[PDB]
Coordinates of C-alpha atoms and ligand atoms in Angstrom, one line a residue:
Chain A
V1 CA 5.5 -43.2 -64.4
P2 CA 3.2 -45.9 -65.7
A3 CA 0.1 -46.5 -63.4
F4 CA 1.2 -50.0 -62.6
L5 CA 4.5 -48.8 -61.3
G6 CA 3.0 -45.9 -59.3
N7 CA 0.5 -48.4 -57.7
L8 CA 3.4 -50.8 -57.0
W9 CA 5.5 -48.0 -55.4
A10 CA 2.6 -47.0 -53.2
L11 CA 1.8 -50.6 -52.3
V12 CA 5.3 -51.6 -51.3
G13 CA 5.9 -48.6 -49.2
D14 CA 2.5 -48.5 -47.5
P15 CA 2.9 -49.5 -43.8
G16 CA -0.6 -50.9 -43.9
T17 CA 0.5 -53.6 -46.3
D18 CA 4.0 -54.3 -44.8
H19 CA 2.7 -57.5 -43.2
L20 CA 2.5 -59.0 -46.7
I21 CA 4.6 -56.8 -49.0
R22 CA 7.4 -54.5 -47.9
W23 CA 10.8 -53.0 -48.8
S24 CA 14.0 -54.8 -47.9
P25 CA 15.9 -53.1 -45.1
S26 CA 17.9 -50.9 -47.4
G27 CA 15.1 -50.5 -50.0
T28 CA 16.9 -52.0 -53.0
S29 CA 14.5 -54.9 -53.3
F30 CA 11.1 -55.8 -52.0
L31 CA 9.6 -59.0 -50.5
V32 CA 6.2 -60.7 -50.7
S33 CA 6.2 -62.7 -47.5
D34 CA 3.0 -64.7 -47.8
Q35 CA 2.1 -65.1 -51.5
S36 CA -1.3 -66.6 -51.0
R37 CA -2.5 -64.0 -48.6
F38 CA -0.9 -61.3 -50.8
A39 CA -2.7 -62.5 -53.9
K40 CA -6.1 -62.8 -52.0
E41 CA -5.9 -59.7 -49.8
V42 CA -3.6 -57.2 -51.3
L43 CA -3.7 -57.6 -55.1
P44 CA -7.5 -57.2 -55.2
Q45 CA -7.2 -53.8 -53.5
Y46 CA -4.5 -52.4 -55.7
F47 CA -4.8 -54.3 -59.1
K48 CA -8.3 -55.8 -59.1
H49 CA -7.3 -59.4 -59.6
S50 CA -6.1 -62.2 -57.4
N51 CA -3.7 -64.0 -59.8
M52 CA -0.1 -64.1 -58.5
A53 CA 1.1 -65.3 -61.9
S54 CA -0.5 -62.3 -63.5
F55 CA 1.2 -59.8 -61.2
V56 CA 4.5 -61.6 -61.7
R57 CA 4.1 -61.5 -65.5
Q58 CA 3.6 -57.7 -65.2
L59 CA 6.7 -57.4 -63.1
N60 CA 8.5 -59.4 -65.7
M61 CA 7.3 -57.1 -68.4
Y62 CA 8.9 -54.1 -66.6
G63 CA 12.2 -56.0 -66.2
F64 CA 12.0 -56.9 -62.6
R65 CA 14.1 -59.9 -61.5
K66 CA 14.0 -62.4 -58.6
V67 CA 16.6 -62.5 -55.7
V68 CA 17.5 -66.0 -54.7
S69 CA 20.1 -67.7 -52.5
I70 CA 23.6 -68.5 -53.9
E71 CA 23.3 -72.1 -52.7
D81 CA 6.5 -68.0 -49.4
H82 CA 9.2 -65.3 -49.2
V83 CA 9.7 -64.2 -52.8
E84 CA 12.0 -61.2 -53.3
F85 CA 11.9 -59.0 -56.4
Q86 CA 14.5 -56.4 -57.6
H87 CA 14.7 -53.8 -60.4
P88 CA 17.7 -51.5 -60.7
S89 CA 15.4 -48.5 -61.0
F90 CA 12.9 -49.4 -58.2
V91 CA 14.6 -48.3 -55.0
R92 CA 12.9 -46.9 -51.8
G93 CA 13.0 -43.2 -51.8
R94 CA 14.4 -42.8 -55.3
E95 CA 11.3 -41.3 -56.7
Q96 CA 13.0 -39.8 -59.8
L97 CA 14.8 -43.0 -60.6
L98 CA 11.4 -44.7 -60.9
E99 CA 10.9 -42.7 -64.1
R100 CA 13.5 -45.0 -65.7
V101 CA 11.5 -48.2 -65.4
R102 CA 10.2 -49.1 -68.9
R103 CA 8.2 -51.9 -70.4
Chain B
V1 CA 34.8 -52.8 -43.2
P2 CA 36.3 -56.3 -43.5
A3 CA 39.0 -56.6 -46.1
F4 CA 37.0 -58.9 -48.3
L5 CA 34.3 -56.1 -48.7
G6 CA 36.8 -53.3 -49.2
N7 CA 38.5 -55.3 -51.9
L8 CA 35.2 -56.2 -53.5
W9 CA 34.1 -52.6 -53.4
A10 CA 37.3 -51.5 -55.2
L11 CA 37.1 -54.4 -57.7
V12 CA 33.5 -53.7 -58.7
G13 CA 33.9 -49.9 -58.9
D14 CA 37.2 -50.0 -60.8
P15 CA 36.6 -48.8 -64.4
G16 CA 39.5 -50.9 -65.5
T17 CA 37.6 -54.1 -64.6
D18 CA 34.2 -53.0 -65.8
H19 CA 34.5 -55.2 -68.9
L20 CA 34.2 -58.2 -66.5
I21 CA 32.7 -56.9 -63.2
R22 CA 30.8 -53.7 -62.8
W23 CA 28.0 -52.0 -60.9
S24 CA 24.5 -52.2 -62.3
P25 CA 23.2 -48.8 -63.7
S26 CA 21.8 -47.8 -60.4
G27 CA 24.5 -49.5 -58.3
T28 CA 22.2 -51.7 -56.3
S29 CA 23.7 -54.9 -57.6
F30 CA 26.8 -55.9 -59.5
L31 CA 27.4 -58.0 -62.6
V32 CA 30.1 -60.4 -63.6
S33 CA 29.9 -60.7 -67.4
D34 CA 32.0 -63.8 -67.9
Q35 CA 33.0 -65.9 -64.8
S36 CA 35.9 -67.9 -66.3
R37 CA 37.7 -64.8 -67.7
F38 CA 36.8 -62.9 -64.5
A39 CA 38.4 -65.5 -62.3
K40 CA 41.6 -65.8 -64.4
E41 CA 42.1 -62.1 -65.3
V42 CA 40.6 -59.7 -62.7
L43 CA 40.1 -61.7 -59.5
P44 CA 43.9 -62.0 -58.8
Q45 CA 44.4 -58.3 -59.2
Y46 CA 42.2 -57.6 -56.2
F47 CA 42.1 -60.9 -54.3
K48 CA 45.4 -62.6 -55.2
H49 CA 43.9 -66.0 -56.2
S50 CA 41.9 -67.1 -59.3
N51 CA 39.4 -69.6 -57.7
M52 CA 35.9 -68.5 -58.6
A53 CA 34.4 -71.1 -56.2
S54 CA 36.3 -69.6 -53.3
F55 CA 35.1 -66.1 -54.2
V56 CA 31.5 -67.1 -54.5
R57 CA 31.7 -69.0 -51.2
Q58 CA 32.9 -65.8 -49.6
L59 CA 30.0 -63.8 -51.2
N60 CA 27.6 -66.4 -49.7
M61 CA 29.3 -66.1 -46.3
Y62 CA 28.7 -62.4 -46.3
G63 CA 25.1 -62.9 -47.3
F64 CA 25.2 -61.9 -50.9
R65 CA 22.3 -63.3 -53.1
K66 CA 22.0 -63.9 -56.9
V67 CA 19.6 -61.9 -59.1
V68 CA 17.9 -64.0 -61.7
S69 CA 15.2 -63.7 -64.4
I70 CA 11.6 -64.1 -63.1
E71 CA 11.2 -67.2 -65.2
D81 CA 27.9 -66.9 -68.9
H82 CA 27.0 -63.9 -66.6
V83 CA 25.8 -63.7 -63.1
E84 CA 24.5 -60.8 -61.0
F85 CA 24.9 -60.6 -57.2
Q86 CA 23.2 -58.4 -54.7
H87 CA 23.4 -57.6 -51.0
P88 CA 21.0 -55.1 -49.4
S89 CA 24.0 -53.4 -47.8
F90 CA 26.3 -53.3 -50.8
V91 CA 25.2 -50.3 -52.9
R92 CA 27.3 -48.0 -55.1
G93 CA 28.2 -44.9 -53.2
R94 CA 26.7 -46.1 -49.9
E95 CA 30.0 -46.2 -48.1
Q96 CA 28.6 -46.1 -44.6
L97 CA 26.0 -48.8 -45.4
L98 CA 28.8 -51.1 -46.2
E99 CA 29.6 -51.2 -42.5
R100 CA 26.4 -53.3 -42.0
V101 CA 27.5 -56.2 -44.1
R102 CA 28.4 -59.1 -41.7
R103 CA 29.7 -62.6 -41.9
Chain C
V1 CA 26.2 -35.0 -68.7
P2 CA 27.9 -31.6 -69.4
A3 CA 31.7 -31.8 -69.3
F4 CA 31.9 -29.5 -66.3
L5 CA 29.7 -31.8 -64.2
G6 CA 31.6 -34.9 -65.4
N7 CA 34.9 -33.4 -64.4
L8 CA 33.4 -32.3 -61.1
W9 CA 32.0 -35.8 -60.4
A10 CA 35.4 -37.3 -61.1
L11 CA 37.3 -34.7 -59.1
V12 CA 35.1 -34.9 -56.0
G13 CA 35.2 -38.7 -55.9
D14 CA 38.9 -39.1 -56.7
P15 CA 40.9 -40.3 -53.6
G16 CA 43.9 -38.4 -54.9
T17 CA 42.1 -35.1 -54.3
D18 CA 40.3 -36.0 -51.1
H19 CA 42.8 -34.0 -49.0
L20 CA 41.3 -30.8 -50.6
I21 CA 37.9 -31.8 -52.1
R22 CA 35.8 -34.8 -51.1
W23 CA 32.3 -36.1 -50.6
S24 CA 30.5 -35.7 -47.2
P25 CA 30.2 -39.0 -45.3
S26 CA 26.9 -39.9 -46.9
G27 CA 27.7 -38.3 -50.2
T28 CA 24.8 -35.9 -50.4
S29 CA 27.1 -32.9 -50.4
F30 CA 30.8 -32.2 -50.9
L31 CA 33.4 -30.1 -49.1
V32 CA 36.4 -28.0 -50.2
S33 CA 38.5 -28.0 -47.0
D34 CA 41.3 -25.6 -48.0
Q35 CA 40.0 -23.1 -50.6
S36 CA 43.4 -21.5 -51.3
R37 CA 45.2 -24.8 -51.9
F38 CA 42.2 -26.1 -53.8
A39 CA 42.2 -23.2 -56.2
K40 CA 46.0 -23.3 -56.7
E41 CA 46.6 -27.1 -56.8
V42 CA 43.4 -28.8 -57.9
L43 CA 41.5 -26.3 -60.1
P44 CA 44.4 -26.0 -62.5
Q45 CA 44.5 -29.7 -63.1
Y46 CA 40.8 -30.2 -63.7
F47 CA 39.5 -26.8 -65.0
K48 CA 42.6 -24.9 -66.2
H49 CA 42.1 -21.8 -64.0
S50 CA 43.0 -20.9 -60.4
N51 CA 40.0 -18.6 -59.7
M52 CA 37.8 -19.9 -56.9
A53 CA 35.2 -17.2 -57.7
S54 CA 35.0 -18.6 -61.2
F55 CA 34.5 -22.2 -60.1
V56 CA 31.8 -21.0 -57.6
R57 CA 30.1 -19.0 -60.4
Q58 CA 29.9 -22.2 -62.5
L59 CA 28.5 -24.2 -59.6
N60 CA 26.0 -21.4 -59.1
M61 CA 25.0 -21.7 -62.8
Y62 CA 24.2 -25.3 -62.4
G63 CA 22.1 -24.6 -59.3
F64 CA 24.4 -25.8 -56.6
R65 CA 23.8 -24.3 -53.1
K66 CA 25.9 -23.8 -50.0
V67 CA 25.5 -25.7 -46.7
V68 CA 25.9 -23.5 -43.6
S69 CA 25.3 -23.8 -39.9
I70 CA 21.9 -23.0 -38.5
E71 CA 23.4 -20.6 -35.9
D81 CA 38.2 -22.7 -45.3
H82 CA 35.6 -25.5 -45.1
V83 CA 33.0 -24.6 -47.7
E84 CA 30.3 -27.2 -48.4
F85 CA 28.2 -27.4 -51.6
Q86 CA 25.0 -29.3 -52.3
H87 CA 22.9 -30.0 -55.4
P88 CA 19.8 -32.3 -55.1
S89 CA 21.0 -34.2 -58.2
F90 CA 24.7 -34.5 -57.3
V91 CA 25.0 -37.4 -54.9
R92 CA 27.8 -39.9 -54.5
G93 CA 27.1 -43.1 -56.5
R94 CA 23.9 -41.7 -58.1
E95 CA 25.4 -41.7 -61.6
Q96 CA 22.1 -41.6 -63.4
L97 CA 20.7 -38.8 -61.2
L98 CA 23.6 -36.6 -62.4
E99 CA 21.9 -36.4 -65.8
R100 CA 19.3 -34.2 -64.2
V101 CA 21.7 -31.4 -63.3
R102 CA 21.0 -28.6 -65.8
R103 CA 22.2 -25.0 -66.4
Chain D
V1 CA 15.8 -43.7 -33.8
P2 CA 15.1 -40.9 -31.3
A3 CA 11.5 -39.8 -31.3
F4 CA 12.3 -36.3 -32.6
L5 CA 13.8 -37.9 -35.8
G6 CA 11.0 -40.4 -36.3
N7 CA 8.4 -37.6 -36.0
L8 CA 10.4 -35.4 -38.3
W9 CA 10.7 -38.2 -40.9
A10 CA 7.0 -38.7 -40.8
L11 CA 6.2 -35.0 -40.9
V12 CA 8.5 -34.4 -43.9
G13 CA 7.4 -37.5 -45.8
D14 CA 3.6 -37.0 -45.2
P15 CA 1.9 -35.9 -48.6
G16 CA -0.7 -34.1 -46.5
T17 CA 1.9 -31.7 -45.2
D18 CA 3.9 -31.2 -48.5
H19 CA 2.3 -27.8 -49.1
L20 CA 4.4 -26.6 -46.1
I21 CA 7.2 -29.2 -45.5
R22 CA 8.4 -31.7 -48.1
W23 CA 11.4 -33.6 -49.3
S24 CA 13.5 -32.1 -52.1
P25 CA 13.2 -33.8 -55.4
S26 CA 16.0 -36.3 -54.6
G27 CA 15.3 -36.4 -50.9
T28 CA 18.6 -35.3 -49.7
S29 CA 17.2 -32.2 -48.0
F30 CA 13.8 -30.9 -47.0
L31 CA 12.1 -27.6 -47.5
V32 CA 9.7 -25.6 -45.4
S33 CA 7.8 -23.3 -47.7
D34 CA 6.4 -20.9 -45.2
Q35 CA 7.7 -20.9 -41.6
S36 CA 4.9 -19.0 -39.9
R37 CA 2.1 -21.2 -41.4
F38 CA 4.2 -24.3 -40.9
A39 CA 4.6 -23.6 -37.2
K40 CA 0.9 -22.8 -36.7
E41 CA -0.6 -25.5 -38.9
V42 CA 1.6 -28.5 -39.4
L43 CA 4.1 -28.5 -36.5
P44 CA 1.5 -29.3 -33.8
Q45 CA 0.2 -32.3 -35.8
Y46 CA 3.5 -34.1 -35.4
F47 CA 5.3 -32.4 -32.5
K48 CA 2.3 -31.0 -30.4
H49 CA 3.6 -27.5 -30.0
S50 CA 3.7 -24.5 -32.4
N51 CA 7.1 -22.9 -31.5
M52 CA 9.3 -22.6 -34.6
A53 CA 12.3 -21.5 -32.5
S54 CA 12.1 -24.7 -30.4
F55 CA 11.9 -26.8 -33.5
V56 CA 14.8 -25.2 -35.2
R57 CA 16.9 -25.4 -32.0
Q58 CA 16.2 -29.2 -32.0
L59 CA 17.3 -29.4 -35.6
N60 CA 20.5 -27.7 -34.6
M61 CA 21.0 -30.0 -31.7
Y62 CA 20.8 -33.0 -34.1
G63 CA 23.3 -31.4 -36.4
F64 CA 21.0 -30.2 -39.2
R65 CA 22.4 -27.4 -41.4
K66 CA 20.7 -24.9 -43.7
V67 CA 21.0 -24.9 -47.5
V68 CA 21.3 -21.4 -49.0
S69 CA 22.0 -19.8 -52.3
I70 CA 25.7 -19.5 -53.3
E71 CA 25.4 -15.7 -53.2
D81 CA 9.8 -17.0 -46.5
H82 CA 11.2 -20.5 -47.1
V83 CA 14.1 -22.4 -45.6
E84 CA 15.8 -25.7 -46.6
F85 CA 17.5 -28.0 -44.1
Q86 CA 19.9 -30.8 -44.6
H87 CA 21.7 -33.5 -42.5
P88 CA 24.1 -36.0 -44.2
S89 CA 22.2 -38.8 -42.4
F90 CA 18.6 -37.6 -43.1
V91 CA 17.8 -38.8 -46.6
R92 CA 14.5 -39.9 -48.1
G93 CA 14.2 -43.6 -48.1
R94 CA 17.5 -44.2 -46.2
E95 CA 15.8 -45.6 -43.1
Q96 CA 18.9 -47.3 -41.7
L97 CA 21.1 -44.2 -42.2
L98 CA 18.7 -42.3 -39.9
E99 CA 20.2 -44.4 -37.1
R100 CA 23.4 -42.4 -37.5
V101 CA 21.9 -39.0 -36.5
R102 CA 23.0 -38.2 -33.0
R103 CA 22.4 -35.4 -30.6
Ligands
NA1 NA1 4.0 -52.2 -47.7
NA2 NA1 16.7 -42.7 -51.7
NA3 NA1 34.7 -52.7 -62.3
NA4 NA1 24.7 -43.4 -52.7
NA5 NA1 38.3 -36.2 -54.1
NA6 NA1 24.0 -44.2 -54.6
NA7 NA1 5.3 -33.5 -46.1
NA8 NA1 17.1 -44.5 -50.5

């Protein structure tokens, strides 16, 4: 598992960051609920920058997508990034 | 499980429809690979009409979302609609 | 996926065999609820023998285990044989 | 979620206890790798007693089963106790 993904897995699932980034209820996507606080408070700790565009570009490079309504709270999804599915994470690729 | 969801589960999971509507590799979302052909050919088999707008409105009413690139086919997701998670399907609500 | 496992996956999940072999409610194990009928009616169709000991030996060769009470209905489990987890099935090995 | 199950979920999932109690690779069962040391060392941390018999009786009362070879460590399973399946845990009942 690439370091970025291992750090992302830990970060999403950590209860100490859930006020800003957390799994969805079923774990098949994850939410960043306050992008500005996330980029200033959380991204420094785990990725040593504060640039939300940069983090998003790295998600894009691993194939993550965005979840939006059919008709701030941003929601990301990757088919192989699912809470608890540790072995499935090995299928995320650049 | 409301009949809409049971029908949708069967439609998505049916190998015979996978050329037009299928689970994602991990089963946490589903893909419609061509909306016009899907509505004409496969929608009636399971839903007995051919109106894509009606179908998508129902998805919206059950809380489905779309999955789009971070930056014709469509991908839909619901936290409680996951391949194999039959009991979880009981949590999808209007 | 080895043919035996592909056939086993299809067999367990098939609604037309659920009266004799079926997934548990959450799909993390599966049950054979009438071993004699299963071996006489189901195993011929899918594995061209009627020998429950043989089928069990093949499960044992792929690392399947039995689920029993802490203190007929036989229940089998393999960590990588889970309803809906199609990609995980690729990790079952002899 | 009853306190027993919340404590068990935390105990199993804690990396700091994985040398004695851990999820299986796929998370559909959990393993206790040495019962005597587990009861003396790690059980009190999460349950505040050191009585393996009491703990196993509680597992039985919540419907947990053992996973054994088809033919000292122990492996326990419950259809509704699955790594990452937080909502499913609400289905475990006394
Ligand atoms: Na978190
Ligand atoms: Na999981
Ligand atoms: Na299909
Ligand atoms: Na599943
Ligand atoms: Na079946
Ligand atoms: Na699944
Ligand atoms: Na642990
Ligand atoms: Na999960």
